Enzyme design. Structure first.
Site, PDB file in Angstrom:
ATOM      1  N   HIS A 118      59.432  42.270  53.020  1.00  0.00           N
ATOM      2  CA  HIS A 118      57.993  42.377  52.870  1.00  0.00           C
ATOM      3  C   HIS A 118      57.565  42.133  51.414  1.00  0.00           C
ATOM      4  O   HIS A 118      56.656  41.353  51.137  1.00  0.00           O
ATOM      5  CB  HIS A 118      57.551  43.766  53.351  1.00  0.00           C
ATOM      6  CG  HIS A 118      56.108  44.084  53.105  1.00  0.00           C
ATOM      7  ND1 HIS A 118      55.158  44.040  54.107  1.00  0.00           N
ATOM      8  CD2 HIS A 118      55.456  44.482  51.986  1.00  0.00           C
ATOM      9  CE1 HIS A 118      53.982  44.382  53.606  1.00  0.00           C
ATOM     10  NE2 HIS A 118      54.135  44.660  52.325  1.00  0.00           N
ATOM     11  N   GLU A 119      58.207  42.817  50.476  1.00  0.00           N
ATOM     12  CA  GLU A 119      57.822  42.679  49.077  1.00  0.00           C
ATOM     13  C   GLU A 119      57.986  41.253  48.584  1.00  0.00           C
ATOM     14  O   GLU A 119      57.142  40.734  47.839  1.00  0.00           O
ATOM     15  CB  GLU A 119      58.630  43.644  48.205  1.00  0.00           C
ATOM     16  CG  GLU A 119      58.385  45.130  48.538  1.00  0.00           C
ATOM     17  CD  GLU A 119      56.917  45.541  48.567  1.00  0.00           C
ATOM     18  OE1 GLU A 119      56.083  44.892  47.892  1.00  0.00           O
ATOM     19  OE2 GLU A 119      56.608  46.542  49.268  1.00  0.00           O
ATOM     20  N   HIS A 122      55.075  39.074  49.101  1.00  0.00           N
ATOM     21  CA  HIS A 122      54.136  39.189  47.981  1.00  0.00           C
ATOM     22  C   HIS A 122      54.600  38.412  46.744  1.00  0.00           C
ATOM     23  O   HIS A 122      53.807  37.714  46.106  1.00  0.00           O
ATOM     24  CB  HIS A 122      53.929  40.652  47.573  1.00  0.00           C
ATOM     25  CG  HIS A 122      53.237  41.492  48.598  1.00  0.00           C
ATOM     26  ND1 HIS A 122      52.135  41.059  49.311  1.00  0.00           N
ATOM     27  CD2 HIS A 122      53.494  42.749  49.027  1.00  0.00           C
ATOM     28  CE1 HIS A 122      51.738  42.023  50.123  1.00  0.00           C
ATOM     29  NE2 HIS A 122      52.550  43.055  49.978  1.00  0.00           N
ATOM     30  N   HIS A 128      48.710  40.778  52.806  1.00  0.00           N
ATOM     31  CA  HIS A 128      48.997  41.475  54.045  1.00  0.00           C
ATOM     32  C   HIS A 128      48.417  40.747  55.243  1.00  0.00           C
ATOM     33  O   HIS A 128      47.408  40.048  55.139  1.00  0.00           O
ATOM     34  CB  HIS A 128      48.471  42.914  53.989  1.00  0.00           C
ATOM     35  CG  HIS A 128      49.309  43.812  53.137  1.00  0.00           C
ATOM     36  ND1 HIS A 128      48.788  44.863  52.421  1.00  0.00           N
ATOM     37  CD2 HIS A 128      50.638  43.800  52.874  1.00  0.00           C
ATOM     38  CE1 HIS A 128      49.758  45.468  51.759  1.00  0.00           C
ATOM     39  NE2 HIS A 128      50.894  44.841  52.018  1.00  0.00           N
TER      40      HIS A 128
HETATM   41  O1  LIG Z   1      51.723  46.202  46.933  1.00  0.00           O
HETATM   42  C1  LIG Z   1      52.080  46.939  47.851  1.00  0.00           C
HETATM   43  C2  LIG Z   1      52.517  48.234  47.564  1.00  0.00           C
HETATM   44  C3  LIG Z   1      52.921  49.104  48.581  1.00  0.00           C
HETATM   45  C4  LIG Z   1      52.914  48.688  49.893  1.00  0.00           C
HETATM   46  N1  LIG Z   1      53.337  49.596  50.937  1.00  0.00           N
HETATM   47  S1  LIG Z   1      54.864  50.201  51.042  1.00  0.00           S
HETATM   48  O2  LIG Z   1      55.611  50.075  49.741  1.00  0.00           O
HETATM   49  O3  LIG Z   1      54.796  51.668  51.427  1.00  0.00           O
HETATM   50  C5  LIG Z   1      55.734  49.276  52.350  1.00  0.00           C
HETATM   51  C6  LIG Z   1      55.120  49.165  53.598  1.00  0.00           C
HETATM   52  C7  LIG Z   1      55.751  48.462  54.624  1.00  0.00           C
HETATM   53  C8  LIG Z   1      56.999  47.863  54.414  1.00  0.00           C
HETATM   54  C9  LIG Z   1      57.649  47.120  55.583  1.00  0.00           C
HETATM   55  C10 LIG Z   1      57.206  47.377  56.888  1.00  0.00           C
HETATM   56  C11 LIG Z   1      57.771  46.745  57.993  1.00  0.00           C
HETATM   57  C12 LIG Z   1      58.789  45.829  57.797  1.00  0.00           C
HETATM   58  C13 LIG Z   1      59.230  45.567  56.499  1.00  0.00           C
HETATM   59  C14 LIG Z   1      58.668  46.213  55.389  1.00  0.00           C
HETATM   60  C15 LIG Z   1      57.620  47.976  53.172  1.00  0.00           C
HETATM   61  C16 LIG Z   1      56.981  48.684  52.126  1.00  0.00           C
HETATM   62  C17 LIG Z   1      52.481  47.394  50.203  1.00  0.00           C
HETATM   63  C18 LIG Z   1      52.076  46.547  49.167  1.00  0.00           C
HETATM   64  O4  LIG Z   1      51.709  45.446  49.485  1.00  0.00           O
HETATM   65 ZN   LIG Z   2      52.587  44.855  50.994  1.00  0.00          ZN
END
Ligand SMILES: O=C1CC=C(NS(=O)(=O)c2ccc(-c3ccccc3)cc2)CC1=O
Ligand SMILES: [Zn+2]
Ligand SMILES: [Ca+2]
Ligand SMILES: [Ca+2]
Ligand SMILES: [Zn+2]
Length: 163
Positions: A118-119, A122, A128
């Site tokens: 996910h990160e 970004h 998102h």
């Molecule tokens: O910039 C930021 C900072 C924090 C965010 N939320 S998080 O760190 O709590 C997070 C949420 C979902 C995921 C995730 C969900 C499902 C599959 C893979 C990753 C990973 C991290 C999301 C985000 O975009």
């Molecule tokens: Zn995110």
């Protein structure tokens, strides 16, 4: 554009560096989680990720607690699990993981591979998604981690930026 605010990398071969580790996993398990998270994006785009062991990489990965030098403090166990910066020089692209989490490579909470994947979306310029099946959905959910299959919405996203 398509998602202004977020830009994009100008080259396709990007370097990454893992700066430190978590006591929750072996070093090999962290390396494998991060490598495979990059691979997800690589197999759906022209991007090639190259690991370096020291020095300056395009994408720095690190585990930090609370305040850690970038004005976006972590918050202890649960809540914010990680964050990343949009493509750019310096801190651009970098991904930080909350060192106070239980990090796993199982279905128990906060599978590191899934959060890293996910990160890195970004880090590559994605925002998102409203699709709950998408990796880029705002909230953590477990999904099977058996192969390099990106959800189709995320494939649409990375293709829209890089082809
Ligand atoms: O910039 C930021 C900072 C924090 C965010 N939320 S998080 O760190 O709590 C997070 C949420 C979902 C995921 C995730 C969900 C499902 C599959 C893979 C990753 C990973 C991290 C999301 C985000 O975009
Ligand atoms: Zn995110
Ligand atoms: Ca947290
Ligand atoms: Ca960077
Ligand atoms: Zn940070």
């Amino acid at each position: 554009m398509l998602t202004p605010g977020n830009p994009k990398w100008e080259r396709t071969n990007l370097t990454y560096r893992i700066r430190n580790y978590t006591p929750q996993l072996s070093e090999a398990e962290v390396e494998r989680a991060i490598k495979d998270a990059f691979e997800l994006w690589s197999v759906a785009s022209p991007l090639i990720f190259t690991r370096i062991s020291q020095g300056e990489a395009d994408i720095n990965i690190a585990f930090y607690q609370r305040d850690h030098g970038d004005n976006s403090p972590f918050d202890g166990p649960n809540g914010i699990l990680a964050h990343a910066f949009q493509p750019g020089q310096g801190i651009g692209g970098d991904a930080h993981f909350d060192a106070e989490e239980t990090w796993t490579n199982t279905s128990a909470n906060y599978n590191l591979f899934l959060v890293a994947a996910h990160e890195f979306g970004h880090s590559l310029g994605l925002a998102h998604s409203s699709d709950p099946g998408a990796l880029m959905y705002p909230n953590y959910a477990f999904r099977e981690t058996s192969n390099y299959s990106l959800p189709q919405d995320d494939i649409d996203g990375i293709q829209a930026i890089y082809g």
